PDB file of N, CA and C in Angstrom:
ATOM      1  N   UNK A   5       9.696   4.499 -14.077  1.00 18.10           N
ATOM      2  CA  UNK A   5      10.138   3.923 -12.810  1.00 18.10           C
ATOM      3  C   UNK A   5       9.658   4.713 -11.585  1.00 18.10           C
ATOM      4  N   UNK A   6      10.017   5.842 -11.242  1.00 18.38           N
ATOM      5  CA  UNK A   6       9.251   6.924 -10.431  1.00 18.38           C
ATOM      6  C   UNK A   6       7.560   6.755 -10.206  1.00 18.38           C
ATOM      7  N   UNK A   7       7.228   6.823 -11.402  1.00 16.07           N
ATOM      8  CA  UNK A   7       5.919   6.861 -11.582  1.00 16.07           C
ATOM      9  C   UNK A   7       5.202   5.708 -10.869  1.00 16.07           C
ATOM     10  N   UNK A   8       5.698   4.888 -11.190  1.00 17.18           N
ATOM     11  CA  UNK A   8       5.585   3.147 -11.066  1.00 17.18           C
ATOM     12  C   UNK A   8       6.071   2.760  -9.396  1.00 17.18           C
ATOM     13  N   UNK A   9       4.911   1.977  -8.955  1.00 14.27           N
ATOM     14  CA  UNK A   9       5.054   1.373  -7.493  1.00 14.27           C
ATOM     15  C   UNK A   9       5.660   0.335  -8.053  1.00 14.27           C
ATOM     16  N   UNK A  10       6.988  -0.506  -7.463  1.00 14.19           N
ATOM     17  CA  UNK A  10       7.536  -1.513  -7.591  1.00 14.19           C
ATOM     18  C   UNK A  10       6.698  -2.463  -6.319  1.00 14.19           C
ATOM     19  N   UNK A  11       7.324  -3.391  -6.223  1.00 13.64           N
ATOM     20  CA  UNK A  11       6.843  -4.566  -4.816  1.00 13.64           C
ATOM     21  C   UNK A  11       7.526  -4.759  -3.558  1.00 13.64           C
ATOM     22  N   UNK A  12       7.017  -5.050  -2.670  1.00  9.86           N
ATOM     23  CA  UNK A  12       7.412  -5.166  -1.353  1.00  9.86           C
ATOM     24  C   UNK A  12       6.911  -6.702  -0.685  1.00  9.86           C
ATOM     25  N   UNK A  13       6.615  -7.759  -1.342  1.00  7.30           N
ATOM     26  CA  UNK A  13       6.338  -8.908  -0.652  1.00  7.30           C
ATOM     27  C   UNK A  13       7.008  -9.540  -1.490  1.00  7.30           C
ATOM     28  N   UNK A  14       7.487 -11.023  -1.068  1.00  6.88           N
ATOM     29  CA  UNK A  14       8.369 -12.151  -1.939  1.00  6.88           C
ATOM     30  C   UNK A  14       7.632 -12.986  -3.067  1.00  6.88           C
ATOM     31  N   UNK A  15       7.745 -14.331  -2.784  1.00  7.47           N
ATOM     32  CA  UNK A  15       6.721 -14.753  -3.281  1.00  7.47           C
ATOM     33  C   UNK A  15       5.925 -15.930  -2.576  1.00  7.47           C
ATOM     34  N   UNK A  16       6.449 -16.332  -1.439  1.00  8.26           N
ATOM     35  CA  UNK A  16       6.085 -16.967   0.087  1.00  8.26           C
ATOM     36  C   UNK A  16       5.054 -16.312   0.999  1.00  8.26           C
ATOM     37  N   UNK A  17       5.128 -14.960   0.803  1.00  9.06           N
ATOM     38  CA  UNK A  17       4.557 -14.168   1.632  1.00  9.06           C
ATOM     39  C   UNK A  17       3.462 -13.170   1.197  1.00  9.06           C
ATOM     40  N   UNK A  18       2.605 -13.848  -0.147  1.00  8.54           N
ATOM     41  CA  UNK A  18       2.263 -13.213  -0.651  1.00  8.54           C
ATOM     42  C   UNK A  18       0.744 -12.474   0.266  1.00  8.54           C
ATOM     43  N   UNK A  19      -0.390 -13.305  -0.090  1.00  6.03           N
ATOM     44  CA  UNK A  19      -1.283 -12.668   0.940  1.00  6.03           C
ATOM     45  C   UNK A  19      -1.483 -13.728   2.481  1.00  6.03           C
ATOM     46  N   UNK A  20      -0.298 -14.039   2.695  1.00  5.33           N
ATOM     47  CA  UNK A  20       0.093 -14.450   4.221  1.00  5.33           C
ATOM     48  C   UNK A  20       0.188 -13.461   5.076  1.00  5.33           C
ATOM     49  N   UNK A  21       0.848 -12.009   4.581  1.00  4.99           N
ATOM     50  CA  UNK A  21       0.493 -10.655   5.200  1.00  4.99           C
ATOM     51  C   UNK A  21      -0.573 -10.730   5.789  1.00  4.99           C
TER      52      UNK A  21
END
């Protein structure tokens, strides 16, 4: 888990960023 990047976008907003 540490190790590991989790996510920060939804799933609406994906490459709409």
């Amino acid at each position: 888990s540490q190790y590991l990047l989790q996510d920060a976008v939804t799933e609406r907003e994906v490459l709409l960023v």
